[PDB]
Design a protein around this ligand. Structure first.
Ligand SMILES: Nc1ncnc2c1ncn2[C@@H]1O[C@H](COP(=O)(O)OP(=O)(O)OP(=O)(O)O)[C@@H](O)[C@H]1O
Ligand SMILES: Nc1ncnc2c1ncn2[C@@H]1O[C@H](COP(=O)(O)OP(=O)(O)O)[C@@H](O)[C@H]1O
Ligand SMILES: Nc1ncnc2c1ncn2[C@@H]1O[C@H](COP(=O)(O)OP(=O)(O)O)[C@@H](O)[C@H]1O
Lengths: 959, 287, 671
């Protein structure tokens, strides 16, 4: 059938089922008199076309109230199933209207109080209006809205009135009380016939009140309206009846058996399943499932026809619609629970998924060339491709998709691969606009008008939408996916709420509207929904990317595939990379050295919260340097290159070294020793012979030998004027290893953060290597609570220049051949926002991951050319140290620069003492006791009188 | 006082362009906060006994500061009213035919205001324009004229909104667009969505002069039994009320016809699917 | 104990109706014969034996400490004229406070009548009303005119402005301002502190309620039309008075305190008037059969009185009352208002035709009124008296350094609370078992809550010892513990609205004990003991989830679906009763106002009868209609009836009827 005629049919079955139930009840009750209440209680219609006036030809009488039919064309709308609760609601509202009162249905939200009122208003043909009293409430418009209701004869519904705050609630209640007291006079015992209509005052002037209007106040009440409003308890709707009627109207044979099964299933879904902020098992969600099941049944019957015929299993069709809507929103833990519940409510029947073999073969080709992992089931990658296919389904159905899941899942990769697969399969191009919120101001996101010139300037999202709409450039044949990667927040989605819903139009502050073209898909790549309004989550479908979807084997496969093909030096490098990947391949498998080490490291204690991707990224970054130490070794020695035999023994030990300094590079020395001991008993790589010295205290060298770090610490003698001077670090056991790690992580230009107690020596260890490198010029930046992205923008404008579009706008340092590093002093200091997102952290993340950001002057993408970031932090447990978000944390490895030990302090200050005592040659023999006293006294003062007693007892090598 | 005697010597008005290619004053926070600080400082030093170096240097400038404050806090209101009414009177059409006296009075007011803007732009110095005589009085005259004409415009909007009371559901700007674009009847159809329950478009004639029927979001059409001619009712409210009344009448007539048709189906036990489906197709879902 | 071993009269005194006039001597005192010592000793004994007489013994103690004339002034009707003539300064405005559902303007009106002084009565709520009241105040201070504002509590800002303005002195001493206003927590505190407050309450009792309602109804609206309207109005008055007097007995009466002011009675009167006008168009004496009984019953059960009923069982009870009263039998001569009253007496209809006969009968009602008038058991009075007594005790306890006492009680809690809870059983074969899943989640969340409570209480102990520094969370935790109010961070399972922290830690220890037993059983066996656990439903955090898990386990054990099962119960006596395959044994259930012999219920005056080892059986329902000899009892969790766990079907005896069980408020309580 055509959709309009389909809706007409469905309405007819609904009303005819209502009439059948009414007639059956009348027959069973043995009713014979036409004036009996059990018949007079039903909504009865009386049509008499002989009357000349249009308005009162049709009369509707519920119990005794005799309303007319306001002949207003309602369009098509939706008709509510008339349940016993709906019957009671109709009766009570009609009685309230007869007594010139109002209706105030109360109950939990989702029952259908607002819809019941709207259905009643549509039944009489009245122009019923619904006002949302939760938010987006325009109190200024009500002054004329109420006058319109009075002078037109239109109804009014206030959804969740109590949600209004007291200041607005008192004024709205005063207006409603005035209206009700003016409407109560229309039924005066002595002034029933009103020659002069009763008037009220709302706009500070008298306005006529038509008797046709009404006002309803739904809740979840002020003493002004207690005497002028009837109340009804819409507590629980009859979901079984609603389901049974919708199933019967959708053509499902045996509707009651399906309904009294699906309703208990949706009841169990609220108990046996972990509570989530996005789970919707209410009546509205049930309806969407039933109409989807009807569509699926019609598709099945019409497909069987092209190959009446009513023998399909109805239960297997009702569980396919459920599994195509609830599974994408399910976390990895609830998925085995949903099928367990299905095996109880619907025993014996099973869910069969559409194969979609047309797209699962373009996924295998978009992958395996982006060096990603592909699956087809219980094998590796099956869950990931499954999530990609579900995301494709949500894109097909909705347009405001919201992929959600913990940091470390393949959310970004999933939608990128989907875009490329769609481009290949359908021949339609795909362009992604990754707009990052919480990095630019909401004004810069949308725009504003200056109150003096009233000139309208567009923001980022507004400009992007305007370019997509106005300028074609393959409009309908380019897939514009505006991915809103970042963190969801009410502030910047207030404007988008008009776009996520079916309106698909954006209302700019100047009043201009922009309609979203059907190809545009507004996707929010977010991490969690802790700070998302219920409207935003409810206006769009979603898929949950749980952390179990992306497995470790898939990460290792991606790494080894990138290593064997992507050259580190942007030919022999590729060969040595392939040889290295072959060497570490047995360890980079399921279980094995790397997986066991990671599992053991997850149960340790680290200064910052432990993320798998952070450790894996650091391990991969240092392994990328392990294949560059081979390149330099071969370049230095053209003859006698390091063959496979020496490569094996070099890289087997380098893998263990990198594992130790990545999985325990952010923990205490005891934790490092624990990891080393655990590795020693589970590895097959030759380790240091001496058992009393930790493996951490060794270096792999270039000859594949464990050379201890103490062999690489020189004994230096500083000049007298340069004793304890700024920027003078004496070689020790820590400044020989942390410096090496810093050089390794800066050779890859990887952003990193040094985390350690105040005064330990983070800045000293960093500037000892930054300025040593000839091309690593350092720009100093200090990050405090009040720091905002504007500081980074000012630094860029001060030290960098915008190239005039070589290939797009590019931000590059002023001088050529030099790399700028913006040392972040206390990167975790910036203040925590009220919605859990540090704006500067999300701004630096945008360019650490996507390699750039968006200018606020022309809404143009600018890409960083030679900009590097380095960071420093006190431990997050200290006051004012806000822990960093996982999304930025996984990109930056951290090093724990702990307080120098006693002996290390001896080797550091003893040297300073000797150079200082050169001014007094008579006391050279007393240098060692002086240091032994200084360090001992400092240790004694450090052990006691800690921060517990006072917040200013900071004892550091600075003292 | 040393900085006060020199801050006024070097002070620009910060002229900015307008969409009508005219100059306007943009800086206001500097023109208020700094002047208030200076006037408070001069009042304090005159009050403070330590003033025997400036026996007479601030009284001759206290009146200057008062004049600056009065001129600029009337100028800001004049400017905002002028730009708002300029947008209202130039953006929407038919504002010349509808309320013609208001249009001509605003044209004269805008001519005077633009002449004053050119005068202050030729000498963008606050001292050089405070010396100009008659600026203050002309500014109060302009403020009064803008207030009066804006009040008249609001009264006209209320008068037009009282007729066809469905206009009370839309804002002032939307109502202005509706009443202004009388010729551009294709722009009205973005406002019917809020003025009715389901009605989203009006099916006009071939030349867009006679309303033949209405529509909805889905596309369901309700042909009018008696079409209404906009050419015989040029005012928008009149033919809108006629559309509403004709819609009511058409709904009543189609309901009568539908109930007459369905009496036959109801009385007879035997029901043919073909005729019943045709009856469903012919009539609207509401009916 | 040895003292009460003897004195066989102790049991008779314990069974006495008012065991406070004479109290046996139990304290071991030789010399003290002072009246106050005996009074306080008997008060402690009354708090021990028969706490329902706590208020009576407190009154006797006040009588012995201040003479037997102390509270007698409160009983007499207050004469506001003496108060406002001498000791009320015209600066001080008289606050005419009244409980919602009551009006006190009549008192000031009759005061004016006896004082023959004009009143400038002004209604509050209109925008022009504020200006008119201000003008009247301005023109009355110079002439001493008694301005009386009505329902001034509607406007708080204007009331604040009036309080600020009243500081200005008034020229005339005869001025007397009356700000009639209801008891609303939004009234400015400054006005209350700066004015005289008079409280007015509706006199408890059905007779007073009918007097109030009949005075409310105009004489003209009750006399015209068929004279059957008079008896219909009298029936409405009885029903309204009953359903308001049952509100006082909130737990045993209607689960929640519904608002049933004059608006509902007005709506009912309008409905009766309209439907008698429609049914009886003329003025003839309509027969009782032609009275639209069904119309009135349905309208006052689903539209004007059922419109505020929140749950199913209150609606059932409202329907029961309306069916009992509104019937054609009510116009007979032997129809009883309420049987079983005062043991075996009854209340008859006044055979009247005019409002005068009904009013004369109403004023003739006996002063004594047992709860049996309302259909409730006679011991609902004892329950309410005990609740009021413990409320008084709490009110005075809040009317009363503490480092040491708080540390000692925290250490006692730590010693009493059991140690950590273990959840070290998760077998892949046990994942399928729904009972295992439910017990796993219960034990996990309970253990997490136990760890959190243990950590917080240990921190409190340490900060009391001085070796730790408290923070804002610890500060508010201490503020909650000193006043004995449950911390908000410790609430993760449903608890009665307002309950002592000591009770919370005690029942938390009980829940942790049963969870340790559950964990031990799950360690011993995997899927055999979990079914054989005699679990205590009251201690469960989400017992409805336990019922769901039991249903799931029964459905999965067989081939039946979840929706093919219905609950069947069998109460046993022996604790060692064998359980069947589908039987599930639970303990701790308490039956209110009823008792069972083998499985058949029977009404009993002694509430809270313990049910030993109630067995839950799930059987494949035949989709057949239930008989008329069974009832559907709600199963609440707390002593307060606010949450539904499930519904239980019980066979009643061969004599009692389901309507009596419905109207007595019987239920099954887990705690
Ligand atoms: N087959 C694969 N599927 C998904 N991710 C893979 C695969 N192989 C390797 N990876 C790695 O998994 C990670 C996926 O992270 P992704 O880019 O999706 O993060 P994001 O959504 O942008 O941010 P966040 O992880 O903070 O939520 C990348 O490091 C990617 O290289
Ligand atoms: N009797 C009914 N038949 C069908 N759907 C219903 C019925 N009652 C409510 N609903 C549905 O319930 C959902 C929630 O309605 P809503 O007005 O948002 O509820 P509330 O006013 O309680 O917040 C809607 O999808 C509505 O159509
Ligand atoms: N080899 C070294 N190891 C550790 N600290 C050192 C070393 N050499 C010098 N120091 C001292 O350590 C201190 C580090 O101070 P600072 O750089 O502010 O530390 P942080 O960055 O941890 O806050 C300085 O007083 C510096 O002189």
């Amino acid at each position: 059938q055509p959709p309009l005629r389909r809706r007409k049919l469905e309405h007819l079955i609904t009303e005819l089922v209502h009439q059948r139930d009414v007639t059956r009840s009348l027959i069973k009750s043995k009713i014979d008199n036409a004036k009996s209440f059990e018949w007079l209680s039903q909504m009865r219609f009386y049509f008499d076309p002989k009357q000349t006036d249009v308005l009162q030809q049709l009369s509707i009488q519920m119990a005794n109230a005799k309303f007319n039919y306001g002949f207003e064309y309602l369009g098509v709308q939706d008709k509510l199933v008339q349940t016993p609760l709906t019957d009671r609601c109709y009766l009570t509202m009609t009685q309230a209207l007869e007594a010139r009162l109002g209706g105030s249905p109360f109950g939990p939200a989702g029952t259908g109080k607002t819809e019941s009122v709207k259905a009643l208003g549509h039944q009489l043909g009245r122009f019923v209006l619904v006002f949302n009293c939760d938010e987006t409430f325009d109190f200024q418009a009500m002054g004329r809205i109420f006058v319109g209701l009075c002078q037109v004869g239109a109804w009014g519904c206030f959804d969740e009135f109590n949600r209004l705050e007291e200041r607005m609630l008192s004024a709205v209640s005063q207006q409603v009380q005035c209206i009700q007291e003016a409407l109560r006079e229309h039924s005066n015992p002595n002034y029933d016939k009103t020659s002069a209509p009763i008037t009220c005052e709302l706009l500070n002037k008298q306005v006529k009140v038509s008797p046709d209007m009404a006002i309803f106040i739904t809740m979840n009440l002020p003493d002004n309206l207690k005497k002028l409003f009837r109340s009804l308890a819409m507590t629980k709707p009859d979901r079984q009846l609603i389901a049974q009627v919708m199933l019967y109207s959708q053509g499902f044979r045996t509707a009651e058996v399906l309904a009294n099964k699906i309703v208990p299933f949706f009841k169990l879904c609220d108990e046996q399943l972990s509570s989530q902020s996005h789970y919707d098992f209410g009546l509205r969600a049930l309806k969407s499932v039933l109409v989807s099941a009807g569509n699926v049944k019609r598709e099945r019957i019409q497909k069987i026809k092209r190959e009446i015929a009513e023998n399909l299993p109805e239960q297997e069709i009702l569980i396919q619609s459920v599994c195509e809507t609830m599974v994408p929103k399910l976390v990895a833990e609830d998925i085995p629970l949903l099928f367990s519940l299905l095996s109880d409510v619907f025993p014996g029947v099973q869910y069969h998924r559409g194969e979609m073999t047309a797209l699962r073969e373009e996924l295998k080709k978009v992958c395996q060339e982006m060096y990603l992992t592909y699956g087809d089931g219980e094998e590796v990658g099956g869950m990931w491709v499954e999530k990609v296919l579900q995301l494709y389904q949500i894109t097909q159905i909705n347009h405001g998709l919201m992929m959600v899941g913990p940091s470390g899942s393949g959310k970004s990769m999933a939608w990128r691969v989907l875009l490329k697969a769609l481009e290949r399969l359908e021949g339609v191009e795909g362009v992604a606009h990754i707009i990052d919120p919480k990095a630019i101001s909401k004004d810069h996101l949308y725009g504003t008008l200056d109150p003096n010139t009233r000139e309208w300037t567009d923001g980022l999202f507004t400009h992007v939408l305007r370019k997509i709409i106005d300028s074609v450039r393959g409009e309908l044949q380019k897939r514009q996916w505006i991915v809103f990667d970042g963190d969801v927040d009410p502030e910047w989605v207030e404007n988008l709420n008009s776009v996520l819903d079916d309106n698909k139009l954006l209302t700019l502050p100047n009043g201009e509207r922009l309609s979203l073209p059907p190809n545009v898909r507004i996707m929010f790549e977010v991490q969690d929904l802790k700070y998302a309004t219920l409207a935003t989550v409810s206006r769009c479908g979603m898929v949950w990317f749980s952390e179990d979807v992306l497995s470790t084997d898939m990460i290792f496969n991606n790494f080894l595939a990138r290593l064997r093909s992507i050259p580190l030096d942007d030919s022999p490098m590729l060969q040595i990379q392939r040889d290295a990947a072959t060497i570490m391949q047995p360890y980079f498998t399921s279980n094995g050295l790397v997986t066991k080490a990671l599992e053991h490291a997850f149960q340790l204690e680290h200064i910052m919260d432990l993320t798998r991707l952070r450790c894996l990224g650091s391990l991969f970054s240092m392994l990328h340097q392990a294949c560059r130490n081979v390149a330099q070794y071969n370049a230095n020695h053209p003859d006698f290159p390091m063959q496979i035999e020496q490569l094996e023994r070099y890289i087997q030990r380098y893998l263990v070294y990198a594992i130790l300094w990545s999985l325990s590079g952010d923990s205490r020395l005891k934790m490092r020793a624990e990891l080393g001991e655990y590795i020693r008993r589970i590895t097959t790589v030759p380790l240091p012979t001496a058992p009393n010295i930790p493996i951490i205290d060794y270096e792999v060298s270039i000859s594949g030998e464990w050379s201890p770090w103490q062999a690489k610490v020189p004994q230096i003698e500083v000049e007298t004027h340069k004793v304890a001077a700024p920027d003078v670090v004496v070689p020790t056991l820590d400044t020989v290893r942390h410096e090496a790690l810093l050089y390794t992580w800066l050779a890859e230009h990887k952003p990193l953060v040094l985390c350690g107690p105040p005064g330990s020596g983070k800045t000293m260890t960093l500037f000892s290597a930054l300025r040593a490198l000839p091309d690593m010029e350092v720009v100093g930046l200090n990050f405090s609570s009040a720091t905002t992205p504007e500081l980074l923008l000012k630094t860029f404008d001060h030290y960098c220049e915008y190239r005039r579009t070589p290939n797009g706008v590019v931000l590059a340092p002023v001088q050529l051949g030099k790399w700028l590093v913006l040392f972040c002093d206390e990167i975790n200091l910036p203040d925590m926002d009220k919605y859990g997102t540090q704006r500067v952290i999300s701004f630096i993340r945008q360019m650490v991951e996507h390699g750039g950001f968006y200018r606020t002057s022309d809404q143009t993408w600018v890409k960083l050319e030679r900009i590097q970031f380095v960071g420093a932090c006190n431990p997050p447990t200290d006051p004012g140290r806000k822990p960093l978000s996982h999304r930025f944390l996984r990109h930056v490895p951290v090093v724990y620069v702990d307080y120098p030990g006693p002996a290390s302090l001896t080797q550091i200050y003893g040297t300073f003492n000797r150079a200082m005592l050169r001014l007094i040659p008579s006391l050279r023999t007393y240098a060692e006791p002086l240091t032994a006293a200084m360090v001992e006294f400092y240790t004694m003062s450090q052990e006691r009188f800690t921060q517990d007693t006072q917040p200013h007892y900071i004892y550091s090598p600075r003292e | 006082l040393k900085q006060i005697r020199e801050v006024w010597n070097t002070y620009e008005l910060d002229l900015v362009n307008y969409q009508n290619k005219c100059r306007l004053i943009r800086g206001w926070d500097d023109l208020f906060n700094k002047v208030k600080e200076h006037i408070n400082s001069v009042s304090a030093m005159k009050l403070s006994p330590y003033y025997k170096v400036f026996e007479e240097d601030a009284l001759s400038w206290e009146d200057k500061l008062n004049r600056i404050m009065a001129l600029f806090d009337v100028w800001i209101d004049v400017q905002r009213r002028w730009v708002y009414l300029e947008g209202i009177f130039t953006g929407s059409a038919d504002i010349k035919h509808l309320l013609p006296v208001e249009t001509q009075r605003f044209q004269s007011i805008s001519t005077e205001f633009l002449a004053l803007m050119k005068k202050v732009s030729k000498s963008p110095l606050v001292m050089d324009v405070l010396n100009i005589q008659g600026v203050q009085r002309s500014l109060e005259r302009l403020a009064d004229l803008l207030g009066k004409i804006q009040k008249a415009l609001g009264e006209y909007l209320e008068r037009e909104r009282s007729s066809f009371p469905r206009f009370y559901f839309v804002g002032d700007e939307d109502l202005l667009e509706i009443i202004g674009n009388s010729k551009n009847v294709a722009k009205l159809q973005k406002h019917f969505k809020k003025m009715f329950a389901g009605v989203s478009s009006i099916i006009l004639n071939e030349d867009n002069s006679v309303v033949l029927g209405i529509s909805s979001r889905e596309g369901e059409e309700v042909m009018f039994k008696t079409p209404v001619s906009i050419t015989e009712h040029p005012k928008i409210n009149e033919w809108l009320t006629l559309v509403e009344k004709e819609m009511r009448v058409t709904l009543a007539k189609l309901l009568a016809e539908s109930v007459t048709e369905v009496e036959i189906f109801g009385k007879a036990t035997s029901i043919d699917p073909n005729t019943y489906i045709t009856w469903i197709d012919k009539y609207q879902a509401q009916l | 104990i040895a003292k009460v071993q003897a004195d066989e009269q102790f049991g008779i005194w314990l069974d006495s109706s008012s065991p406070e006039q004479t109290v046996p001597y139990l304290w071991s005192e030789e010399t003290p014969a002072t009246p106050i010592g005996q009074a306080i000793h008997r008060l402690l004994l009354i708090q021990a034996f028969r706490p329902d007489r706590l208020l009576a013994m407190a009154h006797m103690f006040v009588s012995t400490n201040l003479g037997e004339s102390f509270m007698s002034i409160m009983e007499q009707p207050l004469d506001l004229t003496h108060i406002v003539g001498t000791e009320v300064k015209p600066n001080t405005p008289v606050l005419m406070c009244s409980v919602p559902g009551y009006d006190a303007s009549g008192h000031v009106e009759d005061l004016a009548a006896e004082q023959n002084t004009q009143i400038t009565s002004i209604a509050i709520g209109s925008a022009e009303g504020f200006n008119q009241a201000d003008k009247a105040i301005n023109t009355a201070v110079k002439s001493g005119r008694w301005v009386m504002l009505k329902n001034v509590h509607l406007a708080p800002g204007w009331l604040m402005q009036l309080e600020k303005k009243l500081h200005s002195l008034q020229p005339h001493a005869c001025f007397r301002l009356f700000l009639t206003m209801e008891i609303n927590p939004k009234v400015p505190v400054n006005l209350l502190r700066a004015g005289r407050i008079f409280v007015f309450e509706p006199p408890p009792g059905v007779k007073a309620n009918m007097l109030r309602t009949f005075s409310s109804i105009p004489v003209s609206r009750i006399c015209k039309s068929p004279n059957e309207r008079a008896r219909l109005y009298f029936l409405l008055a009885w029903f309204h008075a009953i359903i308001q007097e049952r509100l006082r007995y909130a737990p045993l009466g209607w689960s929640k305190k519904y608002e049933f002011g004059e608006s509902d009675l007005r709506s009912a009167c309008d409905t009766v008037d309209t439907w008698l006008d429609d049914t009886a168009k003329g003025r003839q004496n309509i027969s009782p059969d032609k009275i639209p009984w069904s119309a009135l019953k349905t309208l006052m059960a689903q539209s004007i009185y059922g419109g505020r009923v929140d749950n199913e069982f209150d609606q059932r009870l409202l329907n029961t009352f309306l069916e009992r009263l509104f019937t054609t039998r009510s116009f007979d001569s032997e129809f009883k208002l309420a049987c079983k009253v005062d043991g075996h007496k009854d209340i008859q209809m006044p055979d009247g035709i005019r409002r005068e006969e009904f009013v004369q009968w109403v004023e003739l009602l006996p002063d004594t009124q047992t709860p049996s008038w309302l259909g409730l058991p006679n011991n609902a009075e004892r329950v309410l008296l005990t609740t009021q007594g413990v409320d008084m005790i709490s009110k005075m306890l809040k009317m009363q350094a503490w480092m040491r006492t708080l540390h000692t009680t925290a250490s006692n809690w730590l010693h009493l609370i059991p140690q950590t809870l273990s959840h070290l059983k998760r077998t892949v074969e046990n994942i399928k078992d729904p009972l295992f899943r439910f017990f796993e989640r219960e034990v996990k969340m309970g253990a997490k809550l136990l760890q959190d409570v243990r950590q917080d209480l240990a921190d409190v102990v340490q900060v009391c010892e001085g070796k730790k520094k408290q923070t804002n969370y610890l500060r508010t935790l201490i503020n909650e513990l000193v006043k004995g109010i449950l911390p908000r961070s410790w609430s993760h399972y449903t608890v009665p609205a307002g309950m002592t922290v000591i009770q919370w830690v005690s029942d938390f220890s009980e829940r942790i004990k049963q969870l340790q037993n559950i964990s031990l059983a799950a360690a011993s066996g995997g899927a055999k003991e979990l079914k054989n656990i005699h679990v205590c439903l009251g201690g469960l955090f989400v017992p409805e989830a336990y019922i769901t898990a039991t249903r799931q386990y029964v459905a999965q054990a067989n081939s039946w679906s979840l929706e093919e099962l219905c609950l069947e119960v069998n109460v046993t006596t022996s604790q060692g009763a064998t359980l069947d395959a589908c039987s599930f044994g639970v303990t701790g259930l308490k039956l209110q106002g009823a008792t069972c012999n083998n499985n058949k219920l029977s009404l009993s005056n002694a509430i809270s009868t313990a049910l030993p080892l109630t067995q839950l059986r799930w059987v494949k329902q035949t989709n057949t209609e239930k008989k008329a000899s069974v009832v559907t009892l709600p199963v609440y969790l707390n002593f307060t009836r606010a949450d539904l766990i499930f519904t239980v079907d019980f066979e009643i005896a061969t004599k009692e009827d389901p309507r009596s069980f419905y109207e007595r408020g019987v239920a099954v309580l887990c705690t």
